[PDB]
Scaffold this active site. Structure first.
Site, mmCIF file in Angstrom:
data_model
loop_
_atom_site.group_PDB
_atom_site.id
_atom_site.type_symbol
_atom_site.label_atom_id
_atom_site.label_comp_id
_atom_site.label_asym_id
_atom_site.label_seq_id
_atom_site.Cartn_x
_atom_site.Cartn_y
_atom_site.Cartn_z
ATOM 1 N N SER A 7 56.613 35.426 30.984
ATOM 2 C CA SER A 7 56.881 34.520 29.879
ATOM 3 C C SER A 7 56.432 35.126 28.555
ATOM 4 O O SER A 7 55.448 35.864 28.477
ATOM 5 C CB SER A 7 56.178 33.181 30.113
ATOM 6 O OG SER A 7 54.769 33.333 30.163
ATOM 7 N N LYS A 217 32.590 34.016 39.444
ATOM 8 C CA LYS A 217 32.083 34.830 40.541
ATOM 9 C C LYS A 217 32.679 36.230 40.573
ATOM 10 O O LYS A 217 32.351 37.001 41.481
ATOM 11 C CB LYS A 217 32.334 34.129 41.882
ATOM 12 C CG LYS A 217 31.589 32.805 42.025
ATOM 13 C CD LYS A 217 31.767 32.157 43.401
ATOM 14 C CE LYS A 217 33.199 32.219 43.909
ATOM 15 N NZ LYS A 217 33.352 31.494 45.201
ATOM 16 N N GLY A 218 33.537 36.581 39.619
ATOM 17 C CA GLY A 218 34.047 37.936 39.540
ATOM 18 C C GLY A 218 35.437 38.105 40.116
ATOM 19 O O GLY A 218 36.320 37.274 39.884
ATOM 20 N N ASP A 247 45.387 37.097 32.672
ATOM 21 C CA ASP A 247 46.274 38.118 32.131
ATOM 22 C C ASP A 247 45.474 39.298 31.606
ATOM 23 O O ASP A 247 45.829 40.458 31.838
ATOM 24 C CB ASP A 247 47.135 37.535 31.010
ATOM 25 C CG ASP A 247 47.992 36.372 31.469
ATOM 26 O OD1 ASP A 247 48.444 36.377 32.633
ATOM 27 O OD2 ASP A 247 48.211 35.446 30.660
HETATM 28 C C1 MTP Z 1 56.085 26.807 34.231
HETATM 29 S S1 MTP Z 1 54.423 26.880 33.478
HETATM 30 C C2 MTP Z 1 54.239 28.494 32.648
HETATM 31 N N1 MTP Z 1 55.121 29.462 32.882
HETATM 32 C C3 MTP Z 1 55.001 30.645 32.286
HETATM 33 N N2 MTP Z 1 54.001 30.889 31.446
HETATM 34 C C4 MTP Z 1 53.053 29.947 31.154
HETATM 35 C C5 MTP Z 1 53.147 28.722 31.750
HETATM 36 N N3 MTP Z 1 52.093 27.979 31.293
HETATM 37 C C6 MTP Z 1 51.374 28.734 30.439
HETATM 38 N N4 MTP Z 1 51.957 29.935 30.342
HETATM 39 C C7 MTP Z 1 51.478 31.055 29.530
HETATM 40 O O1 MTP Z 1 50.421 31.666 30.230
HETATM 41 C C8 MTP Z 1 49.502 32.259 29.296
HETATM 42 C C9 MTP Z 1 48.121 32.295 29.907
HETATM 43 O O2 MTP Z 1 48.109 33.049 31.115
HETATM 44 C C10 MTP Z 1 49.632 31.465 27.998
HETATM 45 O O3 MTP Z 1 49.765 32.369 26.901
HETATM 46 C C11 MTP Z 1 50.930 30.647 28.154
HETATM 47 O O4 MTP Z 1 51.878 30.872 27.133
#
Ligand code: MTP
Ligand code: MTP
Ligand code: MTP
Ligand code: MTP
Ligand code: NA
Ligand code: NA
Lengths: 313, 314
Positions: A7, A217-218, A247
């Site tokens: 995303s 917890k790592g 991430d």
């Molecule tokens: C169907 S739910 C979904 N799908 C894909 N990505 C998502 C979703 N919800 C939050 N994010 C993105 O994940 C990031 C944090 O890991 C945040 O930066 C946020 O934008």
């Protein structure tokens, strides 16, 4: 070269100065900021900042221009971001309470068009990537990306995270087989097992490495033969927002791996990047300070580990 | 001329195509996201202006307010006395509504916190004394200072605390209610007001001229201090979509009818019409005023005579 699929979004992050202990929920928040986000954007940004070769592969809207500049300034190749004719970039709206609990809504928008992205074009443009991260994305996009990785012989990391609860057992199963890496957290690992009907051994027989983050917890790195490396957290000093911490860990760990570091050292670097993100509000709002990085790595894991890690950065 | 005090905001409204039935970590995949003009004061002022009323908006917003101002002025709202913050952005309301019209929302006050610097004396010196001042959900101190200044200058006011009732103490709510020409709440908010202030129903009615208690699908009650009660059923809905701003819409329609000389029942019928029109749209000010459709729905719900009397004064 690491190809990050997933995303791309704008994160509207709010802080609730209370605890989610309240249907007509109304939270008086005392902070509201908009930042660059999406799991693929976060991971690509982190890999670029750390000096890695990375290409972002996702769907966004025409509003992506500034985001693109922001990422290109950090060495991220954005040539293969699909730009929607109509839709806006996805938006993640999140409220975080004092306990780091979160209540959020995600509007996919242009993300739904990631299923039209074709990794064949990326390979013809930049060569075959050393690894493709299949992160949270349009579900069909995730499946098609994984299948095209299999068909084109590309190693991939299954990183379904936020989409694990929205996929069926069969869908999750189709995402896992053949993965060079499997990334989840502990709750997501339990959920994956329950939903796919697979046992732990069933999963490990189909992947090269399981990476299971455990929050405070790592992290655990588990090989198919049971060999387990447990890496403790880099203890936090100014915990502020948990968005993007996973991430960040994935990006740091995979950057370390691409730099030739072993599993443990790569996970230690990932832990550092993870805590840096935990201590900032946005997901890409952290700064890379080489000396502070060396210092915190040494404090958590020892002078030798810190030196070996910083040597490759 | 009605002076509307309360929040001015941008509403970021989302639709969750499910039911809220989910270390909290709630994530709602939404299928709609739209940004609209909002804030209780903005909603009520817009509705009064659209209906042909004389109305002035009195609240705090940011420099981003230009387009909102144009939008409201096009509908006859006097925006001269909107405080524009040097620093803060206009408040933002973020809301996700599920299929049952349940809502999970966050409110960032921003510039709203500066409403406590607004002085109704300037408004009266500029436009004359308003016939009524609505004390709607706002910066709490702004609400209290507005009510006290209404008392001090002898201006009739409507206590309309709504969203802020759960965040104010008993003493605070008590100081907002005394002397009000109108008290607007919903039934849950009425129970909460009684519980928090420690007042009985009679205690409240002895201090106000009229209680107006909305009952969602069950309509509205108008209660006088002597117990005289008018119950007005809803204008039945055809395309229920979003509950945001429905109460504001009812208050605006009712007070426009009152300022137009209509009785309590006719005013509440008009308010019910505007309320259902807002219920059937996503944003709070996204509805249109169709004279013919208004007359038809009023007649269907309440009779040709009531509909005719209502539309005559519009
Ligand atoms: C169907 S739910 C979904 N799908 C894909 N990505 C998502 C979703 N919800 C939050 N994010 C993105 O994940 C990031 C944090 O890991 C945040 O930066 C946020 O934008
Ligand atoms: C909720 S504690 C936590 N979680 C993830 N990464 C961390 C943490 N602390 C330091 N790095
Ligand atoms: C302290 S919570 C709060 N305070 C003041 N106003 C609020 C609040 N929450 C939502 N709104 C505004 O109310 C309108 C709907 O009546 C919506 O338009 C929305 O903007
Ligand atoms: C079914 S809920 C409903 N219907 C019609 N008018 C309303 C409603 N709520 C407030 N005013
Ligand atoms: Na963060
Ligand atoms: Na609405």
């Amino acid at each position: 070269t690491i190809a990050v699929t997933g995303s791309i979004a704008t994160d509207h992050l709010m802080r609730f100065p209370g605890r989610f202990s309240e249907v007509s929920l109304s939270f008086l928040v005392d902070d509201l900021v908009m930042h660059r986000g999406g799991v693929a954007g976060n991971m690509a940004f982190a890999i670029g900042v750390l000096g890695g070769e990375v290409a972002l592969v996702g769907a966004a809207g025409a509003d992506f221009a500034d985001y693109r500049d922001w990422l290109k300034a950090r060495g991220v190749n954005c040539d293969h971001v699909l730009i929607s004719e109509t839709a806006h970039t996805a938006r993640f709206t999140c409220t975080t309470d004092v306990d780091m609990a979160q209540i959020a809504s995600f509007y996919p928008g242009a993300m739904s068009e990631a299923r039209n992205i074709k990794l064949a074009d990326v390979v013809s443009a930049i060569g075959k990537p050393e690894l493709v991260i299949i992160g949270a994305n349009d579900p069909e996009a995730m499946f098609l990306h994984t299948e095209e990785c299999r068909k084109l012989g590309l190693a991939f990391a299954a990183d379904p995270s936020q989409q694990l609860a929205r996929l069926s057992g069969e869908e999750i199963r189709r995402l896992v087989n053949g993965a060079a890496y499997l990334f989840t957290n502990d709750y997501e690992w339990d959920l994956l097992l329950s939903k796919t009907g697979w046992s732990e051994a069933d999963v490990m027989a189909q992947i090269d490495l399981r990476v299971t983050t455990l929050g405070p917890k790592g992290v655990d790195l588990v090989e198919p033969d049971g060999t387990t490396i447990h890496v403790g957290v880099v203890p936090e000093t100014s915990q502020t927002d948990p968005t993007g911490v996973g991430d960040a860990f994935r990006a740091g760990f995979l950057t370390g791996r691409s730099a030739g570091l072993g599993l443990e050292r790569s996970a230690q670097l990932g832990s550092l990047v993870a805590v840096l993100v935990l201590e900032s509000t946005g997901t890409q709002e952290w700064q890379w300070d080489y000396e502070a990085a060396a210092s915190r790595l040494a404090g958590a894991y020892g002078e030798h580990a810190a030196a070996e890690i910083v040597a490759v950065l």
